[model samples]
Target: MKEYTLDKAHTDVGFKIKHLQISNVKGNFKDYSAVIDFDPASAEFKKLDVTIKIASVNTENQTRDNHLQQDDFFKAKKYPDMTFTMKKYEKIDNEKGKMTGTLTIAGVSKDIVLDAEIGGVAKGKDGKEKIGFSLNGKIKRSDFKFATSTSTITLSDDINLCIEVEANEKE
Candidate 1:
């Protein structure tokens, strides 16, 4: 059994959604945490979980950002956070895999699949093995109950999530 600690300085989790059927609006959650239990020697990914603080959502526009935290969107005051827990991972290549997980947002949980690729692993100067990974996925915001009430052309239902993580060996 091995424990991998997230390197926050080198990790990023972000999302993008369509805006009024015109363009994409992107943003990121400023505060989040993840726990990964894996064995590089065995090439196994086990027990992965993550939590994203909803209040940390930033979209560059203060008004829009505030709106996202309101009841119509993430409902940060009530729900506060979003989470993901891995259910399975299937290896596709030496550095690629497919992961299936449960995503919980605004009190609703749904299963989602993501395309993941292991960037590389190396021994750092501190004698720790550092591992990097990238992931991409898409989700219907409406499926998670993020629809705007007075809109004919849904105010962006599909959202794209991208994640990059660099993990350092735990002491």
Candidate 2:
């Protein structure tokens, strides 16, 4: 296993929430960091630790973003960062796999599963070993202390998180 730093330029922690029980509202966190460990021969990830700044949430709407930081949702002022720590990795094939982990938000933590796939790997022009992976998962917001019973507001409790990461082996 080799450690790598996620390429922030090509990586994103994106999400979509069902809005008004009708359409989807897409957004993402801009300031986040990750440590990745990959074992290429097995085509499975070794481990991952990711931290996302809750205040960095962006939905192309400032009002909604601010609202998300309130107590009913992320409560960024109290729990500024959301985190995930990998627990197990299982390879289904050379290019696809499953990962079990714990996700924490607003101080609430729950186990979650991520469906992961290796995009590919290559030797960079700078002589670095570059690799990419995509991970998708859905978690219940209420599990993280997000309110779903608000009469004045309503958003899907199920939030789908999609992560794409490109990284090069750490020197």
Candidate 3:
């Protein structure tokens, strides 16, 4: 059995939102943890769960980040964390797959499917076995009652979520 552990250095939890319906703004959550139990050899997953701290959201602007944590947005004080627990993994081919999971944000849970790219398994620089993945998912802010501020007038409802991860195989 292969047990995979998340490599924080090689993982990123990020999101993109349309600004003014003209351009996109990308940001990331700086603090998060994931438990991924998978075997690339057999193309199987026993578990896949990720939890992200809401306060870690960073968009390179302090003012905007602060505003996002308030009631109109994430309400981070009340809901400190967002989570995703994978229910199934559908392997489309050798390198393509789909992940079906329940994503919970600000106390609302919604089912979502993310496109996954299997980036292969190999030995890393430190001689550790590593497996990589790139995932893309989308959600609507309205679905979670995420924002109702005047800023929402210019900000699009669709939020694009992305993840890049490399997990180390446990011995």
Candidate 4:
């Protein structure tokens, strides 16, 4: 199997949530790492693991971002990182696939399924092989024990994740 690492310049780990049950509030984590082991001949992923730094959460607003780091939301000081470990992958078609993984946030872990769109493969200007994919998933903030009654009333529990990854192949 060959190994790959995320090209941070071409990757984004973002999410969207409803604010006041009306409009969507978008945010993302700025720091994260991923390891992908695959076999090009079989077009299969042998292993997938991603870890995101909780303190890197950014939403453009200083106060809100600060609050997110407190005990009310992510509690970044306590749980410094959130992780996802892929358990299985099912090919839906030539361009689509389904991934089942364990998603952990704020010290809570849950199994979630994500819809993956294969972005195929390409060679970068640097002459290195690159692979890309888009993964979409949703999980309830409440499920991860995000507590704060008023905040819950102001924000919807459902959190929609939008992740895009472009990785460089490694020998």
Identify the leading candidate in terms of lDDT: 2
lDDT of 4 by residue, 117-146 (tens): 877777788987888888898888777776
- Window of ten residues with lowest summed lDDT in model 1: 147-156
The lDDT ranking, best first, is 2, 3, 1, 4
* Cα-based lDDT for every prediction: 0.84, 0.87, 0.86, 0.84
| Clash tally, candidates in order | 0, 0, 0, 0
lDDT measured at residue 92 in model 1 versus the true structure, 0 to 100: 82
Tens-digit lDDT track of model 2 for 50-117: 99999999999999999989987777888999999999998899788888999988888999999998
What residue pairs are clashing in model 2?
none
Cα error of candidate 4 at position 118, Å:
0.9
Using alpha carbons, what is the TM-score of model 2? 0.83
lDDT of 3 by residue, 14-128 (tens): 8998754377888999999999988767666668899999999999999989988998888999999999999998888868888999999989998898988888888888987
- TM-score, every prediction: 0.82, 0.83, 0.81, 0.81
lDDT of 3: 0.86
In model 4, which runs have C-alpha deviations exceeding 4 angstroms? 1-21, 148-152
Please report the TM-score between candidate 1 and the true structure: 0.82
